[PDB]
Amino acid sequence: VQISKKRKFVADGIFKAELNEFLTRELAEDGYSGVEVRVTPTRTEIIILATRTQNVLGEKGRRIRELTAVVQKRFGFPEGSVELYAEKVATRGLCAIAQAESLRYKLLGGLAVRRACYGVLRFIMESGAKGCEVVVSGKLRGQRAKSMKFVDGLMIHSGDPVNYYVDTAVRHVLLRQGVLGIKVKIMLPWDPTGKIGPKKPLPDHVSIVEPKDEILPTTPISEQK
């Protein structure tokens, strides 16, 4: 009936993690990006971000009602207590999860990995990203497995800025030969407001406000008609 605040916070985190994994393993094909659980007085509203929304709701909201019902009967909420929505994501091109799923479903049919990886990289760059790198490791026929990597732009690896400037996605692709793991890293651009990128700039980047052209006479003289 009651548990301590440490246990409560840990349980909330576990609930978020398991919910995220559940609707990752269900509808990875539906362009699902991530979940966000919102607190509301005596309520738990859930927002799902996906690139494709007609396919997560489906016809007559079938998929939504089914998976809402199973989340209800799973996570111990009272009868009719869970209501999740499905809204599009404003940043589809530079979300790591979405691009990882895009690559995994470009590769699941059976296709050349270089063309798909370059297409994903080009699409992320044309989405305004500051830089990307895609690593695909696994079997390419033979007695040995190789890892080929596609980079373009500029990217950071160390320090704290990598926590809020780079988003990473690691996904497994199951082929008949075996499993190849893909890794999509996107370096978000700096943008105040809009939630497209982090608010703070790179801590090693110093800005100066730029003056304008000044070609003026020696002394100001008033002019009247």
Partner: protein, 97 residues
């Protein structure tokens, strides 16, 4: 396996009445979090569910210590052909649409 026919028909009216369910793999333990107090032994109910979802004609997916089910119409056709229960008695799950 090792499942009696009365428990078979019991689990079958359970499948008829519920349709869409969630569950967890539990066998040996004597009390259950969410599918106990059903007046039927836990082990035989869960083993009958194992038969239902692992006989070889309805697919499953095992992860995060829990079960989520898509009950195909091939299984419904098998049920209708065996027990001769028509689908004209629609499940009550078609409310709040």
């Amino acid at each position: 396996m090792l499942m009696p026919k009365k428990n078979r028909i019991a689990i079958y009216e359970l499948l008829f009445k519920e349709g869409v369910m969630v569950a967890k793999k539990d066998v040996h333990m004597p009390k259950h979090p969410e599918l106990a107090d059903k007046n039927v032994p836990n082990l035989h109910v869960m083993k009958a569910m194992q038969s239902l979802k692992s006989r070889g004609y309805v697919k499953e997916q095992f992860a995060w210590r829990h079960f989520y089910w898509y009950l195909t119409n091939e299984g419904i056709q098998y049920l209708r052909d065996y027990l001769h229960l028509p689908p004209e008695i629609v499940p009550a799950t078609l409310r709040r649409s």
